[model samples]
Target chain A: DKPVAHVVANPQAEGQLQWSNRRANALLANGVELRDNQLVVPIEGLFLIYSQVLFKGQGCPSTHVLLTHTISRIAVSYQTKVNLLSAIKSPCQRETPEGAEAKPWYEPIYLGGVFQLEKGDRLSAEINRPDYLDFAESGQVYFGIIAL
Target chain B: DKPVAHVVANPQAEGQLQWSNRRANALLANGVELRDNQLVVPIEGLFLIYSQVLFKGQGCPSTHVLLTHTISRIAVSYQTKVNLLSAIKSPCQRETPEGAEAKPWYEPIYLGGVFQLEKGDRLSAEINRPDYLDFAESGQVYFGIIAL
Candidate 1:
């Protein structure tokens, strides 16, 4: 038996996420460490790490911007910050009526996997365009880890 | 103490996914039950459920249809089949070269969350437009569960 953490996104925070235990959806169950935006592993075991992002934008995207949601870890297994799981998205142009406003668009990117993790390993998640993220919505974005 | 399962995608399955445990990446850790296209909860607890889809097309999408990836569940706590997590996406138009055809395009849609699940609770995921789904890719799609 290990630990579990279901960390939700702080609507106001950008790069590193938050230890958002103020809400009920965010779970800091036990044996988990919170350091700013990173979660520290308490023991060595195989863990199921997951992360999600809901990208919402107004109208059609004007440019070809690539959106990336990634979970990286600083652990004994890596030399530096190695990616555990990542979801890359290329924005698409939506059709707008002539002389009319375009409809809003949103997309969710989810990732997860089982990995052999070591004790004291640090886990964190980030995205490229935080403005396009549905930061205000509930349960739309999160990073979680469960020891298996 | 609780265990977990990290499931992977079966490229051949469409609207309902198959429990493809034949591969090395699909880990059916103990206490997880597998039906045709659903996973059964073994105990009453909060479980982290997640899924992802990588949509691929030959050229610019000819239709304006919206693609949906959803993980729905049927449990004693609900009246009917309700959506546990969902991710909606609209196909985008690509810029075709003046004289050449548009290049192939793809988009990845992901969804996940923590839910209070009951024992015998059944969870399954489905997507619209299975043809656009990356049925040929091994790791780009999956539905997984972890008991917390």
Candidate 2:
């Protein structure tokens, strides 16, 4: 319950910020449920949602290796998935002439916002490439939502 | 209004960049108005304010462009402005001039936190260089506040 389900990055194996774990960072207060990489919204309310993705880009290529961080919701009643808030960032931007290998540039691409949500709205923090995600520390990456 | 406003980065000729219309892109309610560069607080309560400064760095090579994203308030107060929340980005170690092949980067330095505020308190999302601010598309950059 992060006193409504504020969960930290549950290591690398966890593709999603799972809610079932009883860890110091995972807080689920009897509202939302974890179901296949999604959080089931408990009730209808304005929610303040946030997510941080710490990425480790090895080669840091000149070509775009996109890291899209999106917080999307899907509900049983709803026909399509809804993106409440999102962000897109690439480790390397401008074109480079040669092997642009620079000691893996590490940084956190963060996204947060407020949105109207419903009871069955299942929420998930989506990253196109989860392998580049860094869970080295608790604060480096996390996803949480609080009722407003 | 759900008492939550998500306003996209409205480009400006002035220093302080504001937010604009397009409900799908933005939803404003209560006291927040686009007339000024700041969002007016509707009432006295706790709010979650979040902002991301997507900045681009450029120079001879990978220049350590100081990226600073600050959310501040301008209320009828003792001082001119109050810093609510902020995030500064740079290198972790000693700065160095990379090879020409190493490309510059565009990063989303995001900061989000909860703060208590009084009615009529105007808030602004400030960046060191508004020129480098990126709101190219829908999800890359944004500023939002939600009452809790």
Candidate 3:
């Protein structure tokens, strides 16, 4: 087994997922920092990794899956490297003029997860994280932000 | 509103959602044939149009989506487009190559009402109809010769 540290942002945050031409260029102007110990261990051999996110207040029935994958080969063996900037899954579905589609979804700006598995193993997991904000109020705002 | 048509598939079919390279090539080859009309149409000044598929059965919901805007743009203006694919409030997502970190959850293949607003009131429609033969089931072997 390998120890992996993770950090992420609440996608519900205001203006966090915005991607305009200026915003696109602004991302290149600065880089996010990470602690040296932070690492994402790849699933060993022919295994699978599955992940999903549960909204803060929504019931498990309404939970949504954010990502999933099967493990095959990695360049660095167990010492797998995950570029957080390139590892994110965006919440948006449409392409933006700024080409925000090119960014990572699991960056510090959105919710995501990783899991390890072996061959013949089913890739399945649930997301049940509770929201820190008021659901009725914050949920509405979150949906609104996504709608726009 | 100009009359446009969208294709809907069995959403419950396993792997139906995934748009694979072979599928893309197949769709490009077969093209969207609307009965007797050519599948191609212009998307300059319309409300919305799109084609969708619903998977059937229990299997890993794996599939890929590509906006072959060159071949066609699925209309996004129909009630089915708006209600089924475009208007879905849930966030869109995708998988990366094995061992790669998660990419942003994008609804590149969006349908329903949400997409109507984003595409600027214009588009065409097409659907890659997935038949039972697409999967590697035992029965496929028995009927493979039918197409031949």
Candidate 4:
């Protein structure tokens, strides 16, 4: 039987944020140790996300999409916590009754942006694009978003 | 009723990278149009996995951890062609299951990497740590090792 825990978000958190069962488990498995007013969690799971800004129709070279665009950084949020263990134990392992399997570990889901965190606070990982993609000169910036 | 699909690592993939239905759906939602060579999927009812690296050490400088360890990144190879998307989607609105309570989006399980469309390609994310941690002196890294 799976343990049931009520998921809640800190009112002080800025921007958009929420928790899922799978995420709770992953935080536990990955050893994301939390502290007072914080939560500890594992650092691994099936999905991952990152945020990026697209400056389409912009003429600035900095705004152009290039191979370098793939590289970005994410900062775990402060006052946040996860249970890595739960994440590992609950990585969408079961197959659908229809016999279709779920997503695997390698294929990660990329979310947008990194949040700020304080001491004793942490996150699993940041979404990254190691490859290089040349944005067509058509005033478009292709920022890679992912999911596993 | 919810839609279902299989997730697995492509056997023919250079590193036998794994994939999932959520990943496919995520890519599409993010504006990554899939092609024949992109989004190589696993056989139905078969979940795939691979080994990931684990970094054992103390927390970074300011994290306030007794040690200086951290998990840096996770990499998995695949046999599909992944077209990075330009637009960003909110998983909170799209991936959230119905009737579920809200939680922090940065949870480890939610850390799935970006999506892809072909085999042989890889997806990964950078781990985030507390800003207080001493990232300059000591930085730890790890990856998820999914099992079948």
Descending-TM-score candidate ranking: 2, 1, 3, 4
Interface RMSD of each: 3.0, 2.9, 15.0, 15.2
Q: Write the per-residue lDDT of candidate 1 for residues B44-83, one digit (tens) a residue.
A: 8878777777887666633345677878887863446766
lDDT of 4 by residue, A30-119 (tens): 333423322332332223222221212212121112111122222244433332211111112112224433332322221232212222
- Give the lowest summed-lDDT range of ten residues in model 3 chain A: A139-148
Name the weakest run of 10 consecutive residues (lDDT summed) in model 1 chain B.
B91-100
Strongest candidate by DockQ: 2
Candidate with the larger lDDT of 2 and 3: 2
Candidate 1 retains true contacts at a fraction of: 0.29
Query: Which candidate tops TM-score?
Result: 2
Between candidates 2 and 4, the lDDT winner: 2
Per-prediction TM-score, please? 0.64, 0.75, 0.22, 0.19
Scored by lDDT, the top model is: 1
Model 2, DockQ value? 0.40
Overlapping backbone residue pairs in candidate 3 total 52
* Model 3 Cα shift for residue A74 (angstroms): 46
lDDT of each: 0.72, 0.69, 0.24, 0.24
Q: Which model, 1 or 3, shows the larger TM-score?
A: 1
Model 4 chain A weakest lDDT span, ten residues long: A85-94
lDDT by residue for model 3 over B1-148, one digit each (tens)? 3323333222345533223222211232222233322233323321222233222222213442322111132343432221112111222233333654433332222222111122222233333433421334211111000000
What docking class should model 2 receive? acceptable
| Per-residue C-alpha lDDT of model 2 across residues B40-112, encoded as one tens digit per residue | 8878888888876676544324344566788888875334897988888762223355544433445677778
